[PDB]
Design a protein around this ligand. Structure first.
Ligand code: SF4
Ligand code: SF4
Ligand code: SF4
Ligand code: SF4
Ligand code: SF4
Ligand code: NI
Ligand code: NI
Lengths: 762, 397, 169
């Protein structure tokens, strides 16, 4: 029916909104290099904001690099979605209706961007097509001499981010509708997570990747032959969530297990636990064969994206492949036929379990003593460590029978092996750390909730009242990868702190795995302490990486439920509404991948601020606003069209934080919105002040910038803060009524409607 | 003493980690707020009769009646219950103190560390009184009395029973003609800009969290805030609940979206809902009836739509004719959709909603409303209303 | 205690590189700053590092930007310190019109102590490429993107160098 101005958008159509965002949130470029390696006219030295042979300055180069990362992430999501959709339509038919959950808008991102309302599975076919076409255009911008300004690369990156969100939504909708995933279930079944959950007394299959097509066939073969009680299947990365959501809408406990994030990927292979490894698409270490052939661990590729230089045995007989892998020259094969793979992997694991027994890279106690005695403290390993761990100090401590420093370093290490390749003594430091933390690994057991899907249109209404009556301080979306600066406990600490204050915490991806890994002193995890509903003090795990499209979609639904705004082709309107009214902040503590960059950029284009880990400064682009400049904090009143002041929150669209206390303070502060009433503003100020005092020893210096009314102040210390306002700031206050009569620079008016667009003013 | 913060609301003091249990199922617990003139009320005073915090033994249960005496220039007993409605939250603002239920079902516990730190009941009552004076500033003076003897608590509980019965009767007998002002709420305008809400004694608010007394107390706290008082003025239609003052205030605060708002009406300028209604109401035109669906119903109505779809067409602060959002206590209103025939128009209801609101359906219309068990499709609904003589049969010619 | 010895890196940001200075040159540059800003990180919470940082800041009345969660260390102390994000500080330093923490104007030279390499290097990339604010690194890691920096040092060597710099301020 009614359509907005931007259906099927391009770089020109979303230029106005992106430019409006960049006028307030200026881009900050932190180049990862002083040179350009792109074309034979180079490499060009752009240091000091100089120009290349093509006239491109270093700011433009950084913008182009970030744009390339965003489009690579978008391409990954869209290609995974396209392959999943094609397989699903081939197997289940093109007329299958979309069954996502109890909702009014089943595809909020698709409706928001394209403007269409898909009903069946085939309705998703054109949308994917559009995305891929646009991808080509965007990819054409990576060519040399294809853009001169950095702002035009930032706008194209924003377009790439929103297209990425569309692709993730398409993929998740297809997979959930087809493979019987949980449909917005607040009581999703719990699944074990950790390296100490795989019983080494049974054959072990380990699936690494992000797809689920072949994993479903493997599980079907296991179930049909009743091998589920004697063979253990584990998942690394998002395929663990995808396999633990398979047919789990009935809440039956799943036999599949979750091993961990990318960090564990090599470590498990080092332990000899896996008996067969299958690799699907992405987040797969490019040296699994190198460290697996040493332990006689077969590695099987299953997708054309990743063939790992292996022989292609697709058109063959399973028995011959089994015999060659068992006693032969090939450490694996590429098996692109899904039925053949689902039949081959279980039999191969069964026949390899009794033959690879007693093989692991963990050194003996005497072997580890000799290894720790071999070091000379040359400092190369600490120089090559991505996390800058103090390896030589730990080795020096362990030289005298003190194996606890390596035990501490085990959690901080990411298992990247970069320290081993610079050691002239050939000391396997990763295996040394694993040997020192063997007992801790054996103790690693946790529980996580399976992917519920999207948030239903009933929980949003149930939580809107709590958000407007000042009982829900905001929404925190803990997502991203697992390249943490100081171990996997930081996400757990942040989630626990925000759940203790009755926030709405939504988790997905590797962060959910690394949060559900720390049991409490009572032997409980956060998912068991707090239910999986969309309500205050509750934590819900949406699912795999492609489930993040739901979280952003949730924001869109808030615009489409309480305000009644049209979603079809209304990117600018809904983005403005989310930026001005909805209090939701994303947190990507360990993001490394280009997919994380695409997700963060797409969230920024929807108006959702994000705080990332200290490593994310390597992404070369952030979006920060100048607090001091008062002329960049003005909007229009959608009733008068006049200029209206707003508090300086959110003060960034994407930023980085070093420690988790700083992240907690930033997340608490950035939940504030200009349109907040007295109760919401009061509760947000309360929590922000409390967190600042607890984690910084001081209370914020800009708190007074968020006090429009005497009801804006916290309840506990109202008089203590009013006295400070009168004394430190000189405001005029009445003491009998405890009322601020003068001093605020913005009079409270709940009916005011902030807008960044002049085209929607009376 | 301790630290007051809204963080310690989920703090559950378990039986293995608590000094003393106050009230609960085994004992008899009570809380009460009483309004008195501002000459017998002493601010910053707590009277404790019998045992105190330092005269108690671990792992026991005590009656623990709490009585609050408030006093102020603009304080009347009609808001007493309103004050009680906050007591719970305030008790859950003190770290290590757990409060459960309200009225005469209270259950307050105390933690080991908190009990060892306070050593008396004076600071806790003082903190509670300071919060209630900070929250509702019109309360000039406040005093608390704590009873821990079984006999005294039984006497106070008998008095509280009589007081609660009187209060419930007074609340029930209140009507729209016993008052001269309604109360407007615009707190939802943070997410629904052009949405105004009007609450009257004969029409509970949209979300169920606001009544006439709640809005009245909020307006007393801040007259010019988002909770304000409306003068009804000249009544224009008693059947359709039209008031000139309400009409003009809606026109002013609606940014010119709806000119009129007719209370207790379904098709003529109905009340405007944002998204937060506890109950939604749809109009079946084939049967010329009204059905209602609550937020928790996972089934589908006879038209084939659930709560989400049928609530996605009545919201945004607009005034679309058809589906209407209401609360849960609106069924008990005597003027419940009066200009639509009232209960004579309700045709379908889910089983849970009927079992919940049985007290509102008249004895003659109880065997006249379909349920999901009885009716699955629209033809089944027609046959059911043809068999059981629903008054909507007459409208079919 | 010679700091200009281990100028060793794992990766290179290009051809332009930091100058490895001695204790005397660092003391002279700190004492000759027109408007210095002691940018400190969460890694200064080590008691020796915290004491040396407080002594350095109070020796020349240098205002402190306690980036990260380093503020609780300076609450009990006397040095004028304010909290600010490191990324936000890097964005602000590339603006000549920024009033600063005191509102007296933008800064000239920033002293860095107690930071992670991959973070301070990323911020210093923008700072040193899109502004003229000089950076002096007195950390035990050799920072490439700083204008002047110490070399790769042991913790005892770093403590000794900081003490010598204190005695030469
Ligand atoms: S960005 Fe990387 S590939 Fe490009 S010039 Fe710099 S170091 Fe080389
Ligand atoms: S693209 Fe431009 S800056 Fe890069 S190498 Fe080629 S000419 Fe030099
Ligand atoms: S690289 Fe090897 S020899 Fe050098 S310090 Fe590290 S462990 Fe010791
Ligand atoms: S494997 Fe671990 S310890 Fe070695 S360099 Fe990588 S992160 Fe550092
Ligand atoms: S729905 Fe309730 S809380 Fe919201 S504006 Fe209306 S009366 Fe107020
Ligand atoms: Ni509402
Ligand atoms: Ni509503």
């Amino acid at each position: 029916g009614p359509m907005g101005p931007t259906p099927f958008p391009t770089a020109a159509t979303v230029r106005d909104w992106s430019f409006t965002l960049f006028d307030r949130y200026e881009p900050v470029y932190t180049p990862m290099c002083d040179q350009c390696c792109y074309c034979t006219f180079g490499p060009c030295n752009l240091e000091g904001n100089r120009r290349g042979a093509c006239g491109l300055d270093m700011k433009g180069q950084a913008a182009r690099e970030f744009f390339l990362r965003c489009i690579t992430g978008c391409a990954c999501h869209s290609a995974h979605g396209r392959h999943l959709l094609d397989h699903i339509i081939s197997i289940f038919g093109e007329d299958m209706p979309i069954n996502m959950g109890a909702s009014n808008v089943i595809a909020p991102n698709i409706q928001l961007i394209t403007g269409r309302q898909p009903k069946t599975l085939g309705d998703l076919k054109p949308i994917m097509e559009y995305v891929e076409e646009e991808l080509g255009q965007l990819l054409a911008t990576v060519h040399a001499g294809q853009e001169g300004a950095a702002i035009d690369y930032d706008n194209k990156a924003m377009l790439a981010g929103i297209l990425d969100h569309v692709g993730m939504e398409v993929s998740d909708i297809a997979q959930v509708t087809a493979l019987g995933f949980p449909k917005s279930d607040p009581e999703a079944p719990l699944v074990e997570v950790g390296m100490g959950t795989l019983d080494a007394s049974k054959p072990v299959i380990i699936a690494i990747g992000h797809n689920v097509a072949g994993v479903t066939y493997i599980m079907d073969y296991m179930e049909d032959n009743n091998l589920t009680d004697k063979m253990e299947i584990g998942g690394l990365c998002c395929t663990a969530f995808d396999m633990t959501r398979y047919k789990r809408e009935d809440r039956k406990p799943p036999y599949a297990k979750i091993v961990g994030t990318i960090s564990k990927e090599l470590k498990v292979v080092r332990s000899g636990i896996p008996d067969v490894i299958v690799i699907d698409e992405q987040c797969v270490r490019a040296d699994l064969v190198e460290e697996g052939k040493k332990l006689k661990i077969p590695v099987i590729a299953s997708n054309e994206k990743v063939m790992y230089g292996l022989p292609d045995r697709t058109n063959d007989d399973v028995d011959a492949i089994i015999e060659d892998i068992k006693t032969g020259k090939i450490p694996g094969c590429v098996m692109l036929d899904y039925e053949k793979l689902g039949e081959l992997v279980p039999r191969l694991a069964m026949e390899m379990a009794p033959l690879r027994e007693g093989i692991s890279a963990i050194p003996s106690d005497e072997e580890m003593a000799s290894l720790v005695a071999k070091c000379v403290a040359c400092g190369e390993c600490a120089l090559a460590c991505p996390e800058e761990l103090d390896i030589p100090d730990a080795i020096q401590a362990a030289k005298e029978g003190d194996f606890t420093a390596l035990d501490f370093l085990h959690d901080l290490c990411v298992g990247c092996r970069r320290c081993e390749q610079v050691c002239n003594k050939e000391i396997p430091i990763l295996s040394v750390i694993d040997k020192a933390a063997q007992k801790a690994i054996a103790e690693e057991k946790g529980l996580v909730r399976a992917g519920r899907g999207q948030v239903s249109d009933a929980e949003i209404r149930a939580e809107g009242l709590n958000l407007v009556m000042g009982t829900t301080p905001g929404v925190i979306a803990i997502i991203g990868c697992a390249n943490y600066p100081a171990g996997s406990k930081d996400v757990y600490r942040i989630a626990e702190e925000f759940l203790n204050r009755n926030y709405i915490v939504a988790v997905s991806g590797c962060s959910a795995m690394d949060i559900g890994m720390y049991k409490d002193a009572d032997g409980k995890t956060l998912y068991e302490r707090f239910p999986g509903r969309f309500e205050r003090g509750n934590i819900l795990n949406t699912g795999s990486c492609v489930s993040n499209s739901h979280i952003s979609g949730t924001c869109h639904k808030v615009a489409a439920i309480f305000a009644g705004r049209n979603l079809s082709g209304n990117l600018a309107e809904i983005a403005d509404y989310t930026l001005n009214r909805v209090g939701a902040v994303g947190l990507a503590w360990g993001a490394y991948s280009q997919k994380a960059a695409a997700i963060g950029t797409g969230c920024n284009m929807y108006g959702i601020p994000a705080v990332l880990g200290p490593h994310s400064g390597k992404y070369r682009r952030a979006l920060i606003a100048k607090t001091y400049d008062e002329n960049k904090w003005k909007v229009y009143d959608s009733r008068n069209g006049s200029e209206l002041d707003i508090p300086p929150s959110p003060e960034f669209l994407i930023t980085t934080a070093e420690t988790w206390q700083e992240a907690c303070v930033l997340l608490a502060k950035n939940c504030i919105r200009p349109s907040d009433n007295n109760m919401g503003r009061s509760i947000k100020l309360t929590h922000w002040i409390e967190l600042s005092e607890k984690y910084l020893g001081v209370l914020p210096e800009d708190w007074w910038k968020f006090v429009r009314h005497e009801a804006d102040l916290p309840l506990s210390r109202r008089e203590e803060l009013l006295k400070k306002l009168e004394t430190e700031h000189g405001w005029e206050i009445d003491w009998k009524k405890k009322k601020i009569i003068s001093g605020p620079k913005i009079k409270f008016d709940v009916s005011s409607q902030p807008t960044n667009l002049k085209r929607l003013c009376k | 003493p301790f630290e007051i913060s809204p963080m310690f609301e989920g703090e559950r003091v378990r039986k293995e980690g608590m000094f003393v249990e106050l009230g609960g199922p085994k004992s008899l617990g009570l809380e009460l707020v009483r309004a008195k003139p501002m000459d017998e009320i002493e601010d910053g005073k707590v009277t404790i009769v019998g045992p105190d915090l330092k005269d108690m033994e671990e792992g026991k249960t005590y009656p623990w009646a709490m009585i609050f005496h408030v006093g102020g220039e603009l304080v009347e007993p009609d808001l007493e219950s309103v004050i009680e409605r906050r007591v719970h939250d305030f008790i859950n603002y003190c770290q290590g103190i757990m409060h459960l239920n309200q009225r005469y079902d209270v259950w307050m516990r105390i933690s080991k560390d908190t009990a060892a730190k306070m050593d008396s009941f004076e600071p806790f009552g003082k903190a509670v009184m300071m919060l209630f004076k900070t929250e509702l500033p019109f309360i000039e003076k406040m005093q608390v009395t704590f009873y821990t003897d079984q006999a005294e608590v039984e006497k106070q509980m008998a008095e509280a029973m009589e007081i609660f019965k009187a209060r419930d009767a007074r609340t029930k007998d209140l009507h729209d003609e016993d008052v001269d002002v309604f109360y407007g709420c615009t707190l939802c305008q943070s997410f629904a800009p052009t949405n105004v809400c009007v609450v009257s004694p004969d029409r509970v608010s949209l979300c169920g969290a606001i009544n006439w007394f709640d809005g009245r107390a909020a307006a007393k706290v801040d007259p010019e805030g988002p909770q304000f008082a409306i003068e009804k003025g000249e009544l224009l239609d008693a059947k359709t609940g039209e008031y000139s003052g309400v009409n003009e205030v809606a026109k002013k605060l609606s940014s010119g979206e709806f000119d009129k708002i007719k209370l207790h009406s379904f098709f003529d300028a109905p009340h405007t809902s944002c998204g937060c209604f506890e109950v939604v109401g749809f109009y079946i035109p084939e049967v010329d009836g009204i059905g209602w669906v609550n937020r928790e119903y996972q089934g589908m109505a006879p038209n084939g739509l659930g709560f989400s779809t049928m609530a996605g067409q009545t919201g945004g602060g607009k005034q679309i004719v058809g589906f209407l959002g209401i609360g849960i206590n609106y069924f008990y209103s005597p003027k419940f959709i009066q200009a639509d025939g009232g209960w004579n128009r309700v045709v379908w209801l889910p089983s849970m909603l009927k079992e919940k609101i049985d007290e509102a359906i008249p004895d003659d219309m109880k065997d006249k409303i379909a349920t999901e068990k009885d009716v699955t499709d629209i033809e089944s609904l027609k046959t059911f209303l043809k068999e059981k003589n629903h008054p909507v049969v007459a409208n079919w010619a | 205690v010679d700091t200009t010895k281990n100028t060793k890196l794992f990766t290179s940001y290009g051809v332009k590189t930091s100058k490895a200075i001695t204790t005397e040159v660092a003391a002279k540059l700190i004492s000759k700053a027109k408007r210095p800003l002691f940018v400190v990180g969460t890694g200064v919470l080590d008691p020796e590092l915290l004491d040396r940082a407080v002594k350095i800041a109070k020796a020349k009345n240098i205002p402190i930007a306690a980036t990260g969660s380093s503020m609780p260390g300076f609450v009990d102390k006397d040095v004028n310190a304010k909290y600010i994000n490191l990324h936000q500080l890097g964005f602000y330093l590339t603006d000549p019109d920024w009033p600063g923490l005191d509102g007296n104007g933008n800064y000239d030279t920033i002293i860095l102590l107690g930071h992670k390499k991959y973070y301070i290097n990323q911020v210093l990339s923008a700072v040193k490429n899109f502004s003229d604010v000089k950076s002096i690194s007195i950390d035990r890691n050799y920072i490439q993107n700083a204008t002047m920096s110490f070399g790769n040092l042991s913790k005892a060597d770093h403590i000794a160098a900081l003490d010598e710099v204190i005695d030469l301020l």
